[PDB]
Amino acid sequence: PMEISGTHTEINLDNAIDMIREANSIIITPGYGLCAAKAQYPIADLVKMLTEQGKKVRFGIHPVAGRMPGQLNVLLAEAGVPYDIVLEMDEINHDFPDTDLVLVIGANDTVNSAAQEDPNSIIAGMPVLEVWKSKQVIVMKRSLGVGYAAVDNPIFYKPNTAMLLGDAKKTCDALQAKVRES
Amino acid sequence: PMEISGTHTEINLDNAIDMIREANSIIITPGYGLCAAKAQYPIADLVKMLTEQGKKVRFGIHPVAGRMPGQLNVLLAEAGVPYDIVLEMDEINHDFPDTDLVLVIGANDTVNSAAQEDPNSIIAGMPVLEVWKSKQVIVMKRSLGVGYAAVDNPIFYKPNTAMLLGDAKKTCDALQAKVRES
Ligand SMILES: NC(=O)c1ccc[n+]([C@@H]2O[C@H](COP(=O)([O-])OP(=O)(O)OC[C@H]3O[C@@H](n4cnc5c(N)ncnc54)[C@H](OP(=O)(O)O)[C@@H]3O)[C@@H](O)[C@H]2O)c1
Ligand SMILES: NC(=O)c1ccc[n+]([C@@H]2O[C@H](COP(=O)([O-])OP(=O)(O)OC[C@H]3O[C@@H](n4cnc5c(N)ncnc54)[C@H](OP(=O)(O)O)[C@@H]3O)[C@@H](O)[C@H]2O)c1
């Protein structure tokens, strides 16, 4: 017989607010999940407040995030996020090591470390946003489920990764609200 | 006001062979010079034989070694070097203090200690492979000259560094040939 296990951590909204408020630089890497939940709006609002509070907050977009090329740039633009804070993977990937917090919102395949850590993965070698290199990662999705490529993501079990489970819009709505009360 | 002195040491092939034969752990840090001279091939054969003699031989690749992204990884692969012995700087730098011998092959800026020793240097604070922390270093290049950054490299003058001057391919071809014949 055989068996293998994995351990992940889940945090609550209060803990997430703590991490956000303590962080000075933040990168948001959105994916298909944000698109499905139509979460562009609450996250745009949140980003505006954090920026006005003096934090460095930028979006890092994978060339193939979502389901259509440039789909995330369009939705973020529709939410009124400034174009100067929406960067492409190639221009921002190098900032992860120097980043305090990364908010992974409805992204999975585009931030999957198996692309570099598993030689026998089907996405091995494929370029991804290296979010795990930052100080703290908060993953916002409904579960530890798979993405389009149907493969497990090692970042879910890394020490510096915390899962904030729930629909992307609901979670961003709540965060945006609790930050407005600060 | 002051004037320090520095001495470099030039060695010949047989001397390099003795250093290799005597080393249990070897790390190779290749750079632009290896590519230019097309020395991937002889070095690949050399590593195979050494590994076969029981020696732990690995490659340490700097993120910006060569002149294109992943250039050294691609050329070494093509020459048949096992992906499992090619490591990125960040995953191997901590082992230099515990390494017997380092073969710097056509690398300079990526192994320049001035990044850590000269606060006024144009490369100050930039990460480099800390080859000089190992027991013995052998540098293979044509001269005591500069690399792309156009700055002198202090490791050529450290007591544990030996210069094995000449075109990288001509040199690697000879080393592989002598190693074979033993
Ligand atoms: N960009 C393009 O043009 C294009 C074209 C063809 C294929 N693709 C492929 O699509 C993938 C895109 O990468 P990605 O990171 O964006 O995608 P994914 O890897 O498709 O990520 C989707 C993630 O969002 C979550 N999600 C779905 N609904 C959600 C919701 N309502 N609230 C919160 N989370 C939700 C899912 O997890 P839960 O189920 O746990 O919530 C899922 O794992 C790539 O594999 C790419 O190659 C892209
Ligand atoms: N990787 C990228 O995509 C990229 C892009 C833009 C800039 N760069 C820059 O390029 C540099 C790369 O670092 P590195 O250590 O590989 O480079 P270097 O510092 O460029 O090293 C080249 C060394 O190899 C030697 N060389 C040239 N031909 C040789 C030959 N035939 N045989 C033996 N030696 C030879 C040269 O010395 P001799 O003349 O004494 O032999 C030289 O000092 C970095 O400063 C990096 O920032 C990289």
Q: Exactly one of B21, B32, B41, B180 is catalytic; which is it? A: B32
Say which residues have a Cβ less than 8 Å from residue A85's Cβ, sequence separation at least 6: A47, A51, A57, A58, A59
The two tokens of residue B161 are: 């560094």
Does B123 sit in the ligand 2 pocket, CB within 6 Å? no
Residue pair B169/B42 in contact by the 8 Å Cβ criterion: yes
Q: Edge-to-edge strands of the sheet including B136-140?
A: B86-88, B56-61, B25-30, B101-105, B136-140, B161-163
User: If you measure from the C-alpha of residue A164 to the centroid of ligand 2, how many angstroms do you get, rounded to a whole number?
Assistant: 45
Task: Tell which atom from ligand 1 comes closest to the C-alpha of A72.
Answer: 1
Q: Would the annotation count A67 as a binding residue?
A: yes
Q: ∠ CA A82-A15-A154 to the nearest 5 degrees?
A: 80
What whole-number distance in Å separates Cα of residue B140 and Cα of residue B104? 6
Q: What are the distances in angstroms from CA B18 to CA B82, B161, B178?
A: 25, 15, 11
Count the Cβ atoms, other than its own, within 10 Å of residue B51. 15
User: If you measure from the C-alpha of residue A123 to the centroid of ligand 2, how many angstroms do you get, rounded to a whole number?
Assistant: 31
What whole-number distance in Å separates Cα of residue A28 and Cα of residue B111? 34
What whole-number distance in Å separates Cα of residue A131 and Cα of residue A63? 15
User: If you measure from the C-alpha of residue A78 to the centroid of ligand 1, how many angstroms do you get, rounded to a whole number?
Assistant: 19
In the residue annotation, B180 being an active-site residue is answered as no
Nearest ligand to the C-alpha atom of residue B34: 2
Residue for token digits 């600060």?
A182
What whole-number distance in Å separates Cα of residue A86 and Cα of residue A59? 5
Residue pair B89/B60 in contact by the 8 Å Cβ criterion: yes
Ramachandran angles phi, psi of A70, nearest 5°? 70, 10
Does A13 sit in the ligand 1 pocket, CB within 6 Å? no
What whole-number distance in Å separates Cα of residue B110 and Cα of residue A150? 38
Residue pair B35/B66 in contact by the 8 Å Cβ criterion: yes
Residue pair B54/B22 in contact by the 8 Å Cβ criterion: no
Ramachandran angles phi, psi of A72, nearest 5°? -70, -40
Rg (CA), chain A: 15
For residue A166, the 8-state DSSP code is: S
**Helix (H) / strand (E) containing A28:** strand A25-30
| Dihedral Cα B139, B144, B148, B153, nearest 10 deg | 70
| Dihedral Cα A72, A75, A79, A83, nearest 10 deg | 50
Residue for token digits 């250093």?
B19
Which residue out of B32, B43, B75, B152 has the highest number of ligand 2 atoms within 8 Å of its CB and is therefore the one to mutate? Answer: B32
What whole-number distance in Å separates Cα of residue B4 and Cα of residue B77? 43
Residue pair B135/B161 in contact by the 8 Å Cβ criterion: no
Chain-centroid distance, C-alpha A117:
19
- Beta partners for residue A61, in sequence order: A88
The two tokens of residue A59 are: 């979006």
User: If you measure from the C-alpha of residue A31 to the centroid of ligand 1, how many angstroms do you get, rounded to a whole number?
Assistant: 6
Q: Give the residue among A66, A41, A19, A32 at the shortest CA–CA distance from A142.
A: A32
What whole-number distance in Å separates Cα of residue A139 and Cα of residue A128? 15
Which residue out of A62, A74, A140, A142 has the highest number of ligand 1 atoms within 8 Å of its CB and is therefore the one to mutate? Answer: A142
The two tokens of residue A156 are: 């879910």
Q: Give the residue among A84, A92, A80, A22 at the shortest CA–CA distance from A50.
A: A22
Q: What are the distances in angstroms from CA B80 to CA B27, B76, B77, B83, B85?
A: 17, 6, 5, 9, 11
Closest residue by Cα to atom 18, ligand 1, is A147
Between helix B168-180 and helix B40-52 the angle, nearest 10°, is 30
The two tokens of residue A146 are: 């798979």
The two tokens of residue B100 are: 């017997």
Three-class DSSP labels, chain B: CCCCCCCCCECCHHHHHHHHHHCCEEEEEECHHHHHHCCHHHHHHHHHHHHHCCCEEEEEECCCCCCCCCHHHHHHHHCCCCHHHEEEHHHHHHHHHHCCEEEEECCCHHHCCHHHHCCCCCCCCCCCCCHHHCCEEEEECCCCCCCCCCCCCHHHHCCCEEECCCCHHHHHHHHHHHHHCC
Q: May I ask the CATH architecture of the domain A1-182?
A: 3-Layer(aba) Sandwich (3.40)
What whole-number distance in Å separates Cα of residue B149 and Cα of residue B113? 13
Q: Would the annotation count A125 as a binding residue?
A: yes
The DSSP annotation for A106-143 comes to: S--GGG-THHHH-TTSTTTT-----GGGSSEEEEESSS
The two tokens of residue B155 are: 């490791």
DSSP SS3 for A51: helix
Domain boundaries, given as residue ranges, for chain B: 1-182
What whole-number distance in Å separates Cα of residue B7 and Cα of residue A1? 63
What whole-number distance in Å separates Cα of residue A108 and Cα of residue A113? 10
Q: What are the distances in angstroms from CA B108 to CA A69, A142, B146, B171?
A: 40, 48, 7, 17
DSSP SS3 for A73: helix
What whole-number distance in Å separates Cα of residue B107 and Cα of residue A28? 36
What whole-number distance in Å separates Cα of residue B141 and Cα of residue B153? 12
Count the Cβ atoms, other than its own, within 10 Å of residue A24. 12
Ramachandran angles phi, psi of A135, nearest 5°? -65, -45
What whole-number distance in Å separates Cα of residue B11 and Cα of residue B166? 11
Q: Would the annotation count A89 as a binding residue?
A: no
In the residue annotation, B148 being an active-site residue is answered as yes
Does A38 sit in the ligand 1 pocket, CB within 6 Å? no
Q: Give the residue among B167, B137, B114 at the shortest CA–CA distance from B9.
A: B137
Write down the H helix ranges in chain A.
Answer: 13-22, 32-37, 40-52, 71-78, 89-92, 114-117, 168-180
What whole-number distance in Å separates Cα of residue A59 and Cα of residue A66? 14
What whole-number distance in Å separates Cα of residue B15 and Cα of residue B162? 10
User: If you measure from the C-alpha of residue A20 to the centroid of ligand 2, how many angstroms do you get, rounded to a whole number?
Assistant: 42
Count the Cβ atoms, other than its own, within 10 Å of residue B18. 11
